């Protein structure tokens, strides 16, 4: 293989070896003839001019290949981009063997972290500086069938070594709640209604800006109702300042965006009493002429009735909805009738971004899809403001690297998305470069994401992408295009990835090293065949009707037991809890003496007694 | 050369191989131990063995559309090129998995796929998969489709009215709800034109609106409705204070029936307008029309 | 009793025949049916009657008149809610249509598996191609030339996109709407009428 | 010379479309530009930058090409 052409940025070769083409082995290691993913090397005197193969066959004119120049070495220094002299006819082009690849893939910086093994040989590491991965941006694009959860979780877990990253801080905005099993004990879990070991996510609504309050609670008031709400909010803030003294807060500089709690249940009670009750004496609308607040029940007609009866009714309905419990009924931030809570927002911030762990998992799985975009925007803005307004102290984002991952972002970061979350993401991308806040996008349909926002991401994680629209859209956002790496996209095995960006010295199509056994992300989906294979047993829909009327998921009813309660209990893996009823205690006593902990359970207790998961 | 041999790789573009059909033309049968397979059909598969493992691919273009640029200028009378798109590969006797490992090089051998290899590709040992049909090429191979993910992930059936989509849907529902293998199937069908009642003579419950001989009668109680949809159905979407008056009177009737009849877990404190509690509609109309 | 009759009977399949119901309110009442089923299977998920224990499949026939681009009905909201949430509550979905260009693109794009039969016009084929994430040019180029009964199963429920022949149902079990036979009725000899009974 | 941006490629009276030459590796929305024609100078204010200034045909021809800016002429300084 001797180069016989120089065409700017693509040389062409004419091999003279008759039929070598059989894994030409040098020094006991078998290198191959010019393949798709191989590297080239054209020696010119003393410096080594290297290259990467892009296309093989008649597309270069068979004995012609389409080689692409990338870089060359100086005086035995290192792998450098920018060649000194493109080779000419007469010199034989050699290949980059395993030690030469190690030298090319070797780095002297200890900040570089080995993320896996090259697909070519399973020994050479992918030295990746994690400063670039957290500080600039990230993006994960590929098909769902390529195993995105596995690779993402492996990257997150390797990034979060206690010995290697003692000052890590990772927030994953998983929507499906599929990462609970991924890091069972290494990350906190925040849901709406946790069960055993997860904390309960709570959002104080008074800590958000006025516009967010109008959008989520008021439903988008803009006329007289919005201005009345502004008046009520200002008056309530002044009353809260007067009733309880807040450091740095007085009646002089009470701003609209002041994160000081104000009565909202009492506000609804006032907005209902001003438009419901009837004045005892006509001509006057006195408060003594009546002809609870925490409770949503409200007690000539009153002349102060508003025209926001529908928004008030919507607010009252939201106050009773169980899905708004984490919205308006925070445990430590439960606003009393006089606007008094047991704790403050600093406690919330400390609980969120100050835990003893390195990774914290916040899950919005149970959130209603009605205002989810506003909730995401509120969370992102709260994090950014908390770590920017306190960025001068060593507790800010600058002294504590923060990396927020957003999954399935093509629905919230679309080309025509006009929500509040996209504004916050743009603000982060445009400001946090100095504030040290990272962002990583996860999606399985890259063709919908905005081009410019994706173009602002530093490093990409390319998985298998069969459809060509996704390939075109991804190529539209990468500025270092090598046809050897550009065309290998749709034939990636489930687990491999292409990492391109500032986090790698050379574009590495490496293998995402699988996470250790026992930590494999998987949502707890039902098994169709297992559920549908069991025989038909009698059912009791009266309990279902009672639960539906009561709107309660709690029924009225390790091998534990209670002979008085006659409820044998067997526990499965992953924290599942079962309560088998109508089980005589002798059966469970025999089961405890049966084998060890199984068999007997499926033999008799599985499909003979009503259970409860 | 050995049988099951087609041509030679002469180009590679990452995931788009261009292959040359060999000189022994006019045959177009290529008999392989009995049955013969037409060479270079659109839907056919190919196999490219590299040393120890095999690479599979599906034909996409045949003829002048697959030949590269310079060859047409050299000779426009020769169109014996095909365009193979990679799909997956077969490991070391383990199974067939998607995603390639090492791409082929120029001069490699491409091979036609024989029916045993098609069985090796479309055959799997997983017990979740169930058979829905046969491949178009040969009817021996069964069409194994996952059932749990089909039900839980999502599904869709799209096709023209002349393509018999109703028969396909009926067959799919019958196969899914087989009593021998799935005795606990639960399927709800919102038939609109009422053309599925004849398919299941005695295997399903039919809820018509005007039953005649043996069908049940559909019935939607009005008190199970919420306030907004009930107003939309009955009153056509009032927007004035009449909506408030109707809501208030419905609340009064619900309170009265709560006083008359006891309900578990429901009191004057935990009762909303949309609570599924029965209430008289004739009394509502009579009161609001006498008033 | 109503819930047990609907989704608790001894028979696996329940068929709701909405042919005789008024056409003006069909969308709304379908919306209420969806809402009732979703709430019943959601608030009792921990019970043995809940969805997480016994899966429930929802089949919507002729979904192109209800899931339009700018539909203002109630059934579209329920369908979107199911599509975006029911993965955890054990409630499925299955859309049967004959005009995919009318179905909302976002709803169609989230369907797990597609069953593309013969498709004639070009707009529907373009929409289907734009609403699939596993595209093989050879397979998708054969859509307008599929035999009566063939199918192309694409999605996450199969190992590969594959052109199948759906097994025919047993004889005597074939869907058929009992619409009037115009030729047979019109071929009959005319008889003297009596419209007093009709009045 | 220095302070060079590119050349104009479309004139619709008062809506000038400019290609930002090459080697850009910047002109904001509110920034000013100068177009010297012969002896006098023409000043303008950038109107839109990005895909909007891309012509209708080029939008389909090249959707990911961001090298066009739209300039609206404002004033002129004489001799």
JSON list of N, CA, C and O in Angstrom, two decimals, chain A residues 35-36 55-58 61-62 464 466 487-488 490-493 528-529 532-536 541 546 549, chain B residues 10-12 14-15 70 86 98-103 105-106 128 148 181-184 186 264 266 276:
[
{"chain": "A", "resi": 35, "resn": "UNK", "atom": "N", "xyz": [-9.09, -1.46, 6.49]},
{"chain": "A", "resi": 35, "resn": "UNK", "atom": "CA", "xyz": [-10.49, -1.71, 6.79]},
{"chain": "A", "resi": 35, "resn": "UNK", "atom": "C", "xyz": [-11.23, -0.39, 6.96]},
{"chain": "A", "resi": 35, "resn": "UNK", "atom": "O", "xyz": [-10.67, 0.69, 6.75]},
{"chain": "A", "resi": 36, "resn": "UNK", "atom": "N", "xyz": [-12.50, -0.47, 7.34]},
{"chain": "A", "resi": 36, "resn": "UNK", "atom": "CA", "xyz": [-13.29, 0.74, 7.53]},
{"chain": "A", "resi": 36, "resn": "UNK", "atom": "C", "xyz": [-12.79, 1.53, 8.74]},
{"chain": "A", "resi": 36, "resn": "UNK", "atom": "O", "xyz": [-12.55, 2.74, 8.66]},
{"chain": "A", "resi": 55, "resn": "UNK", "atom": "N", "xyz": [-13.38, 5.06, 3.03]},
{"chain": "A", "resi": 55, "resn": "UNK", "atom": "CA", "xyz": [-14.08, 4.23, 2.06]},
{"chain": "A", "resi": 55, "resn": "UNK", "atom": "C", "xyz": [-13.07, 3.29, 1.40]},
{"chain": "A", "resi": 55, "resn": "UNK", "atom": "O", "xyz": [-11.90, 3.65, 1.23]},
{"chain": "A", "resi": 56, "resn": "UNK", "atom": "N", "xyz": [-13.54, 2.10, 1.04]},
{"chain": "A", "resi": 56, "resn": "UNK", "atom": "CA", "xyz": [-12.70, 1.08, 0.42]},
{"chain": "A", "resi": 56, "resn": "UNK", "atom": "C", "xyz": [-13.42, 0.57, -0.82]},
{"chain": "A", "resi": 56, "resn": "UNK", "atom": "O", "xyz": [-14.62, 0.28, -0.77]},
{"chain": "A", "resi": 57, "resn": "UNK", "atom": "N", "xyz": [-12.69, 0.46, -1.93]},
{"chain": "A", "resi": 57, "resn": "UNK", "atom": "CA", "xyz": [-13.21, -0.16, -3.14]},
{"chain": "A", "resi": 57, "resn": "UNK", "atom": "C", "xyz": [-13.16, 0.81, -4.32]},
{"chain": "A", "resi": 57, "resn": "UNK", "atom": "O", "xyz": [-12.33, 1.72, -4.37]},
{"chain": "A", "resi": 58, "resn": "UNK", "atom": "N", "xyz": [-14.07, 0.59, -5.28]},
{"chain": "A", "resi": 58, "resn": "UNK", "atom": "CA", "xyz": [-14.10, 1.38, -6.50]},
{"chain": "A", "resi": 58, "resn": "UNK", "atom": "C", "xyz": [-14.49, 2.83, -6.26]},
{"chain": "A", "resi": 58, "resn": "UNK", "atom": "O", "xyz": [-14.33, 3.66, -7.16]},
{"chain": "A", "resi": 61, "resn": "UNK", "atom": "N", "xyz": [-11.46, 5.06, -7.03]},
{"chain": "A", "resi": 61, "resn": "UNK", "atom": "CA", "xyz": [-10.95, 5.17, -8.39]},
{"chain": "A", "resi": 61, "resn": "UNK", "atom": "C", "xyz": [-11.81, 6.12, -9.21]},
{"chain": "A", "resi": 61, "resn": "UNK", "atom": "O", "xyz": [-11.91, 7.31, -8.90]},
{"chain": "A", "resi": 62, "resn": "UNK", "atom": "N", "xyz": [-10.04, -4.00, -7.85]},
{"chain": "A", "resi": 62, "resn": "UNK", "atom": "CA", "xyz": [-9.57, -2.64, -7.60]},
{"chain": "A", "resi": 62, "resn": "UNK", "atom": "C", "xyz": [-8.56, -2.62, -6.46]},
{"chain": "A", "resi": 62, "resn": "UNK", "atom": "O", "xyz": [-8.53, -3.51, -5.62]},
{"chain": "A", "resi": 464, "resn": "UNK", "atom": "N", "xyz": [-26.49, 3.32, 17.75]},
{"chain": "A", "resi": 464, "resn": "UNK", "atom": "CA", "xyz": [-26.96, 2.88, 16.45]},
{"chain": "A", "resi": 464, "resn": "UNK", "atom": "C", "xyz": [-28.19, 3.69, 16.04]},
{"chain": "A", "resi": 464, "resn": "UNK", "atom": "O", "xyz": [-29.15, 3.81, 16.80]},
{"chain": "A", "resi": 466, "resn": "UNK", "atom": "N", "xyz": [-30.61, 3.76, 12.74]},
{"chain": "A", "resi": 466, "resn": "UNK", "atom": "CA", "xyz": [-30.91, 3.13, 11.46]},
{"chain": "A", "resi": 466, "resn": "UNK", "atom": "C", "xyz": [-31.50, 4.12, 10.47]},
{"chain": "A", "resi": 466, "resn": "UNK", "atom": "O", "xyz": [-31.08, 4.17, 9.30]},
{"chain": "A", "resi": 487, "resn": "UNK", "atom": "N", "xyz": [-20.16, 6.72, 8.64]},
{"chain": "A", "resi": 487, "resn": "UNK", "atom": "CA", "xyz": [-20.98, 5.70, 8.01]},
{"chain": "A", "resi": 487, "resn": "UNK", "atom": "C", "xyz": [-21.20, 4.45, 8.83]},
{"chain": "A", "resi": 487, "resn": "UNK", "atom": "O", "xyz": [-22.04, 3.62, 8.45]},
{"chain": "A", "resi": 488, "resn": "UNK", "atom": "N", "xyz": [-20.48, 4.28, 9.94]},
{"chain": "A", "resi": 488, "resn": "UNK", "atom": "CA", "xyz": [-20.62, 3.11, 10.79]},
{"chain": "A", "resi": 488, "resn": "UNK", "atom": "C", "xyz": [-21.77, 3.23, 11.78]},
{"chain": "A", "resi": 488, "resn": "UNK", "atom": "O", "xyz": [-21.92, 2.36, 12.64]},
{"chain": "A", "resi": 490, "resn": "UNK", "atom": "N", "xyz": [-25.27, 2.98, 11.55]},
{"chain": "A", "resi": 490, "resn": "UNK", "atom": "CA", "xyz": [-26.45, 2.10, 11.65]},
{"chain": "A", "resi": 490, "resn": "UNK", "atom": "C", "xyz": [-26.13, 0.64, 11.92]},
{"chain": "A", "resi": 490, "resn": "UNK", "atom": "O", "xyz": [-27.06, -0.18, 11.95]},
{"chain": "A", "resi": 491, "resn": "UNK", "atom": "N", "xyz": [-24.86, 0.27, 12.12]},
{"chain": "A", "resi": 491, "resn": "UNK", "atom": "CA", "xyz": [-24.49, -1.12, 12.34]},
{"chain": "A", "resi": 491, "resn": "UNK", "atom": "C", "xyz": [-23.75, -1.28, 13.66]},
{"chain": "A", "resi": 491, "resn": "UNK", "atom": "O", "xyz": [-22.78, -2.03, 13.77]},
{"chain": "A", "resi": 492, "resn": "UNK", "atom": "N", "xyz": [-24.20, -0.56, 14.69]},
{"chain": "A", "resi": 492, "resn": "UNK", "atom": "CA", "xyz": [-23.57, -0.66, 16.00]},
{"chain": "A", "resi": 492, "resn": "UNK", "atom": "C", "xyz": [-24.26, -1.71, 16.86]},
{"chain": "A", "resi": 492, "resn": "UNK", "atom": "O", "xyz": [-25.49, -1.74, 16.98]},
{"chain": "A", "resi": 493, "resn": "UNK", "atom": "N", "xyz": [-23.46, -2.58, 17.45]},
{"chain": "A", "resi": 493, "resn": "UNK", "atom": "CA", "xyz": [-23.98, -3.61, 18.34]},
{"chain": "A", "resi": 493, "resn": "UNK", "atom": "C", "xyz": [-24.57, -2.98, 19.59]},
{"chain": "A", "resi": 493, "resn": "UNK", "atom": "O", "xyz": [-24.26, -1.85, 19.97]},
{"chain": "A", "resi": 528, "resn": "UNK", "atom": "N", "xyz": [-45.96, -9.78, 30.40]},
{"chain": "A", "resi": 528, "resn": "UNK", "atom": "CA", "xyz": [-47.23, -10.08, 29.74]},
{"chain": "A", "resi": 528, "resn": "UNK", "atom": "C", "xyz": [-47.52, -11.57, 29.79]},
{"chain": "A", "resi": 528, "resn": "UNK", "atom": "O", "xyz": [-48.62, -11.99, 30.17]},
{"chain": "A", "resi": 529, "resn": "UNK", "atom": "N", "xyz": [-46.55, -12.40, 29.42]},
{"chain": "A", "resi": 529, "resn": "UNK", "atom": "CA", "xyz": [-46.78, -13.84, 29.36]},
{"chain": "A", "resi": 529, "resn": "UNK", "atom": "C", "xyz": [-46.97, -14.43, 30.76]},
{"chain": "A", "resi": 529, "resn": "UNK", "atom": "O", "xyz": [-47.84, -15.28, 30.96]},
{"chain": "A", "resi": 532, "resn": "UNK", "atom": "N", "xyz": [-50.47, -13.34, 31.98]},
{"chain": "A", "resi": 532, "resn": "UNK", "atom": "CA", "xyz": [-51.56, -13.92, 31.20]},
{"chain": "A", "resi": 532, "resn": "UNK", "atom": "C", "xyz": [-51.53, -15.44, 31.15]},
{"chain": "A", "resi": 532, "resn": "UNK", "atom": "O", "xyz": [-52.44, -16.04, 30.56]},
{"chain": "A", "resi": 533, "resn": "UNK", "atom": "N", "xyz": [-50.52, -16.08, 31.73]},
{"chain": "A", "resi": 533, "resn": "UNK", "atom": "CA", "xyz": [-50.43, -17.53, 31.69]},
{"chain": "A", "resi": 533, "resn": "UNK", "atom": "C", "xyz": [-51.20, -18.20, 32.83]},
{"chain": "A", "resi": 533, "resn": "UNK", "atom": "O", "xyz": [-51.60, -19.36, 32.68]},
{"chain": "A", "resi": 534, "resn": "UNK", "atom": "N", "xyz": [-51.41, -17.51, 33.94]},
{"chain": "A", "resi": 534, "resn": "UNK", "atom": "CA", "xyz": [-52.08, -18.11, 35.09]},
{"chain": "A", "resi": 534, "resn": "UNK", "atom": "C", "xyz": [-53.55, -18.38, 34.78]},
{"chain": "A", "resi": 534, "resn": "UNK", "atom": "O", "xyz": [-54.18, -17.68, 33.98]},
{"chain": "A", "resi": 535, "resn": "UNK", "atom": "N", "xyz": [-54.09, -19.40, 35.43]},
{"chain": "A", "resi": 535, "resn": "UNK", "atom": "CA", "xyz": [-55.49, -19.75, 35.25]},
{"chain": "A", "resi": 535, "resn": "UNK", "atom": "C", "xyz": [-56.39, -18.67, 35.85]},
{"chain": "A", "resi": 535, "resn": "UNK", "atom": "O", "xyz": [-55.95, -17.81, 36.62]},
{"chain": "A", "resi": 536, "resn": "UNK", "atom": "N", "xyz": [-57.67, -18.73, 35.49]},
{"chain": "A", "resi": 536, "resn": "UNK", "atom": "CA", "xyz": [-58.63, -17.70, 35.90]},
{"chain": "A", "resi": 536, "resn": "UNK", "atom": "C", "xyz": [-59.15, -18.00, 37.30]},
{"chain": "A", "resi": 536, "resn": "UNK", "atom": "O", "xyz": [-59.69, -19.08, 37.55]},
{"chain": "A", "resi": 541, "resn": "UNK", "atom": "N", "xyz": [-64.63, -7.22, 42.54]},
{"chain": "A", "resi": 541, "resn": "UNK", "atom": "CA", "xyz": [-64.61, -5.85, 42.07]},
{"chain": "A", "resi": 541, "resn": "UNK", "atom": "C", "xyz": [-65.24, -4.87, 43.05]},
{"chain": "A", "resi": 541, "resn": "UNK", "atom": "O", "xyz": [-65.16, -3.66, 42.83]},
{"chain": "A", "resi": 546, "resn": "UNK", "atom": "N", "xyz": [-64.87, 0.37, 45.84]},
{"chain": "A", "resi": 546, "resn": "UNK", "atom": "CA", "xyz": [-64.66, 1.11, 47.07]},
{"chain": "A", "resi": 546, "resn": "UNK", "atom": "C", "xyz": [-63.41, 1.98, 46.98]},
{"chain": "A", "resi": 546, "resn": "UNK", "atom": "O", "xyz": [-63.43, 3.15, 47.39]},
{"chain": "A", "resi": 549, "resn": "UNK", "atom": "N", "xyz": [-64.17, 4.96, 44.58]},
{"chain": "A", "resi": 549, "resn": "UNK", "atom": "CA", "xyz": [-64.98, 5.98, 45.23]},
{"chain": "A", "resi": 549, "resn": "UNK", "atom": "C", "xyz": [-64.18, 6.75, 46.26]},
{"chain": "A", "resi": 549, "resn": "UNK", "atom": "O", "xyz": [-64.26, 7.98, 46.33]},
{"chain": "B", "resi": 10, "resn": "UNK", "atom": "N", "xyz": [-17.17, -4.95, -4.02]},
{"chain": "B", "resi": 10, "resn": "UNK", "atom": "CA", "xyz": [-16.30, -4.03, -4.74]},
{"chain": "B", "resi": 10, "resn": "UNK", "atom": "C", "xyz": [-16.42, -2.60, -4.23]},
{"chain": "B", "resi": 10, "resn": "UNK", "atom": "O", "xyz": [-15.85, -1.69, -4.84]},
{"chain": "B", "resi": 11, "resn": "UNK", "atom": "N", "xyz": [-17.15, -2.37, -3.14]},
{"chain": "B", "resi": 11, "resn": "UNK", "atom": "CA", "xyz": [-17.28, -1.04, -2.57]},
{"chain": "B", "resi": 11, "resn": "UNK", "atom": "C", "xyz": [-17.77, -1.18, -1.13]},
{"chain": "B", "resi": 11, "resn": "UNK", "atom": "O", "xyz": [-18.38, -2.19, -0.76]},
{"chain": "B", "resi": 12, "resn": "UNK", "atom": "N", "xyz": [-17.50, -0.15, -0.34]},
{"chain": "B", "resi": 12, "resn": "UNK", "atom": "CA", "xyz": [-17.97, -0.09, 1.04]},
{"chain": "B", "resi": 12, "resn": "UNK", "atom": "C", "xyz": [-18.11, 1.38, 1.43]},
{"chain": "B", "resi": 12, "resn": "UNK", "atom": "O", "xyz": [-17.24, 2.20, 1.11]},
{"chain": "B", "resi": 14, "resn": "UNK", "atom": "N", "xyz": [-19.43, 2.29, 4.81]},
{"chain": "B", "resi": 14, "resn": "UNK", "atom": "CA", "xyz": [-19.87, 2.21, 6.18]},
{"chain": "B", "resi": 14, "resn": "UNK", "atom": "C", "xyz": [-20.99, 1.21, 6.40]},
{"chain": "B", "resi": 14, "resn": "UNK", "atom": "O", "xyz": [-20.80, 0.20, 7.08]},
{"chain": "B", "resi": 15, "resn": "UNK", "atom": "N", "xyz": [-22.16, 1.47, 5.81]},
{"chain": "B", "resi": 15, "resn": "UNK", "atom": "CA", "xyz": [-23.30, 0.57, 5.96]},
{"chain": "B", "resi": 15, "resn": "UNK", "atom": "C", "xyz": [-24.05, 0.40, 4.65]},
{"chain": "B", "resi": 15, "resn": "UNK", "atom": "O", "xyz": [-25.25, 0.11, 4.65]},
{"chain": "B", "resi": 70, "resn": "UNK", "atom": "N", "xyz": [-18.15, 6.09, -11.92]},
{"chain": "B", "resi": 70, "resn": "UNK", "atom": "CA", "xyz": [-17.18, 5.97, -13.01]},
{"chain": "B", "resi": 70, "resn": "UNK", "atom": "C", "xyz": [-17.46, 4.80, -13.93]},
{"chain": "B", "resi": 70, "resn": "UNK", "atom": "O", "xyz": [-17.15, 4.88, -15.13]},
{"chain": "B", "resi": 86, "resn": "UNK", "atom": "N", "xyz": [-26.53, -3.38, 5.39]},
{"chain": "B", "resi": 86, "resn": "UNK", "atom": "CA", "xyz": [-26.25, -4.29, 6.49]},
{"chain": "B", "resi": 86, "resn": "UNK", "atom": "C", "xyz": [-27.39, -4.28, 7.51]},
{"chain": "B", "resi": 86, "resn": "UNK", "atom": "O", "xyz": [-28.08, -3.27, 7.70]},
{"chain": "B", "resi": 98, "resn": "UNK", "atom": "N", "xyz": [-28.27, -8.02, 16.43]},
{"chain": "B", "resi": 98, "resn": "UNK", "atom": "CA", "xyz": [-28.13, -6.82, 15.63]},
{"chain": "B", "resi": 98, "resn": "UNK", "atom": "C", "xyz": [-26.82, -6.11, 15.96]},
{"chain": "B", "resi": 98, "resn": "UNK", "atom": "O", "xyz": [-26.25, -6.26, 17.05]},
{"chain": "B", "resi": 99, "resn": "UNK", "atom": "N", "xyz": [-26.33, -5.33, 15.00]},
{"chain": "B", "resi": 99, "resn": "UNK", "atom": "CA", "xyz": [-25.10, -4.60, 15.18]},
{"chain": "B", "resi": 99, "resn": "UNK", "atom": "C", "xyz": [-23.88, -5.37, 14.72]},
{"chain": "B", "resi": 99, "resn": "UNK", "atom": "O", "xyz": [-23.60, -6.46, 15.23]},
{"chain": "B", "resi": 100, "resn": "UNK", "atom": "N", "xyz": [-23.14, -4.81, 13.77]},
{"chain": "B", "resi": 100, "resn": "UNK", "atom": "CA", "xyz": [-21.96, -5.46, 13.22]},
{"chain": "B", "resi": 100, "resn": "UNK", "atom": "C", "xyz": [-20.77, -5.20, 14.12]},
{"chain": "B", "resi": 100, "resn": "UNK", "atom": "O", "xyz": [-20.79, -4.34, 15.01]},
{"chain": "B", "resi": 101, "resn": "UNK", "atom": "N", "xyz": [-19.70, -5.96, 13.90]},
{"chain": "B", "resi": 101, "resn": "UNK", "atom": "CA", "xyz": [-18.46, -5.82, 14.65]},
{"chain": "B", "resi": 101, "resn": "UNK", "atom": "C", "xyz": [-17.32, -5.31, 13.79]},
{"chain": "B", "resi": 101, "resn": "UNK", "atom": "O", "xyz": [-16.70, -4.29, 14.12]},
{"chain": "B", "resi": 102, "resn": "UNK", "atom": "N", "xyz": [-17.02, -5.98, 12.68]},
{"chain": "B", "resi": 102, "resn": "UNK", "atom": "CA", "xyz": [-15.99, -5.55, 11.75]},
{"chain": "B", "resi": 102, "resn": "UNK", "atom": "C", "xyz": [-16.54, -5.57, 10.34]},
{"chain": "B", "resi": 102, "resn": "UNK", "atom": "O", "xyz": [-17.11, -6.58, 9.90]},
{"chain": "B", "resi": 103, "resn": "UNK", "atom": "N", "xyz": [-16.38, -4.46, 9.62]},
{"chain": "B", "resi": 103, "resn": "UNK", "atom": "CA", "xyz": [-16.91, -4.33, 8.28]},
{"chain": "B", "resi": 103, "resn": "UNK", "atom": "C", "xyz": [-16.04, -5.08, 7.28]},
{"chain": "B", "resi": 103, "resn": "UNK", "atom": "O", "xyz": [-14.84, -5.25, 7.49]},
{"chain": "B", "resi": 105, "resn": "UNK", "atom": "N", "xyz": [-14.06, -6.05, 3.61]},
{"chain": "B", "resi": 105, "resn": "UNK", "atom": "CA", "xyz": [-13.09, -5.39, 2.75]},
{"chain": "B", "resi": 105, "resn": "UNK", "atom": "C", "xyz": [-13.33, -5.78, 1.30]},
{"chain": "B", "resi": 105, "resn": "UNK", "atom": "O", "xyz": [-14.13, -6.66, 0.99]},
{"chain": "B", "resi": 106, "resn": "UNK", "atom": "N", "xyz": [-12.62, -5.10, 0.40]},
{"chain": "B", "resi": 106, "resn": "UNK", "atom": "CA", "xyz": [-12.75, -5.38, -1.03]},
{"chain": "B", "resi": 106, "resn": "UNK", "atom": "C", "xyz": [-12.24, -6.78, -1.33]},
{"chain": "B", "resi": 106, "resn": "UNK", "atom": "O", "xyz": [-11.27, -7.25, -0.72]},
{"chain": "B", "resi": 128, "resn": "UNK", "atom": "N", "xyz": [-41.54, -16.00, 25.25]},
{"chain": "B", "resi": 128, "resn": "UNK", "atom": "CA", "xyz": [-42.52, -14.93, 25.13]},
{"chain": "B", "resi": 128, "resn": "UNK", "atom": "C", "xyz": [-43.07, -14.82, 23.71]},
{"chain": "B", "resi": 128, "resn": "UNK", "atom": "O", "xyz": [-44.25, -14.52, 23.52]},
{"chain": "B", "resi": 148, "resn": "UNK", "atom": "N", "xyz": [-45.83, -9.58, 25.06]},
{"chain": "B", "resi": 148, "resn": "UNK", "atom": "CA", "xyz": [-45.90, -8.68, 26.21]},
{"chain": "B", "resi": 148, "resn": "UNK", "atom": "C", "xyz": [-45.57, -7.26, 25.80]},
{"chain": "B", "resi": 148, "resn": "UNK", "atom": "O", "xyz": [-46.29, -6.32, 26.15]},
{"chain": "B", "resi": 181, "resn": "UNK", "atom": "N", "xyz": [-53.52, -21.23, 26.00]},
{"chain": "B", "resi": 181, "resn": "UNK", "atom": "CA", "xyz": [-52.26, -20.64, 26.42]},
{"chain": "B", "resi": 181, "resn": "UNK", "atom": "C", "xyz": [-52.42, -19.39, 27.26]},
{"chain": "B", "resi": 181, "resn": "UNK", "atom": "O", "xyz": [-51.59, -19.13, 28.14]},
{"chain": "B", "resi": 182, "resn": "UNK", "atom": "N", "xyz": [-53.47, -18.60, 27.03]},
{"chain": "B", "resi": 182, "resn": "UNK", "atom": "CA", "xyz": [-53.72, -17.37, 27.77]},
{"chain": "B", "resi": 182, "resn": "UNK", "atom": "C", "xyz": [-55.14, -17.39, 28.29]},
{"chain": "B", "resi": 182, "resn": "UNK", "atom": "O", "xyz": [-56.05, -16.78, 27.71]},
{"chain": "B", "resi": 183, "resn": "UNK", "atom": "N", "xyz": [-55.38, -18.09, 29.41]},
{"chain": "B", "resi": 183, "resn": "UNK", "atom": "CA", "xyz": [-56.74, -18.18, 29.96]},
{"chain": "B", "resi": 183, "resn": "UNK", "atom": "C", "xyz": [-57.19, -16.94, 30.72]},
{"chain": "B", "resi": 183, "resn": "UNK", "atom": "O", "xyz": [-58.32, -16.93, 31.22]},
{"chain": "B", "resi": 184, "resn": "UNK", "atom": "N", "xyz": [-56.35, -15.92, 30.82]},
{"chain": "B", "resi": 184, "resn": "UNK", "atom": "CA", "xyz": [-56.67, -14.71, 31.58]},
{"chain": "B", "resi": 184, "resn": "UNK", "atom": "C", "xyz": [-56.55, -13.47, 30.70]},
{"chain": "B", "resi": 184, "resn": "UNK", "atom": "O", "xyz": [-56.18, -12.39, 31.16]},
{"chain": "B", "resi": 186, "resn": "UNK", "atom": "N", "xyz": [-57.62, -10.20, 28.62]},
{"chain": "B", "resi": 186, "resn": "UNK", "atom": "CA", "xyz": [-58.57, -9.12, 28.88]},
{"chain": "B", "resi": 186, "resn": "UNK", "atom": "C", "xyz": [-58.42, -8.10, 27.75]},
{"chain": "B", "resi": 186, "resn": "UNK", "atom": "O", "xyz": [-57.45, -7.34, 27.72]},
{"chain": "B", "resi": 264, "resn": "UNK", "atom": "N", "xyz": [-69.53, 4.60, 52.30]},
{"chain": "B", "resi": 264, "resn": "UNK", "atom": "CA", "xyz": [-68.29, 4.43, 53.06]},
{"chain": "B", "resi": 264, "resn": "UNK", "atom": "C", "xyz": [-67.23, 5.40, 52.57]},
{"chain": "B", "resi": 264, "resn": "UNK", "atom": "O", "xyz": [-66.99, 5.53, 51.37]},
{"chain": "B", "resi": 266, "resn": "UNK", "atom": "N", "xyz": [-67.20, 8.58, 52.45]},
{"chain": "B", "resi": 266, "resn": "UNK", "atom": "CA", "xyz": [-67.70, 9.82, 51.86]},
{"chain": "B", "resi": 266, "resn": "UNK", "atom": "C", "xyz": [-68.57, 10.52, 52.89]},
{"chain": "B", "resi": 266, "resn": "UNK", "atom": "O", "xyz": [-69.51, 9.92, 53.43]},
{"chain": "B", "resi": 276, "resn": "UNK", "atom": "N", "xyz": [-68.74, 10.08, 41.95]},
{"chain": "B", "resi": 276, "resn": "UNK", "atom": "CA", "xyz": [-69.72, 9.18, 41.33]},
{"chain": "B", "resi": 276, "resn": "UNK", "atom": "C", "xyz": [-70.79, 8.72, 42.32]},
{"chain": "B", "resi": 276, "resn": "UNK", "atom": "O", "xyz": [-70.77, 7.58, 42.78]}
]
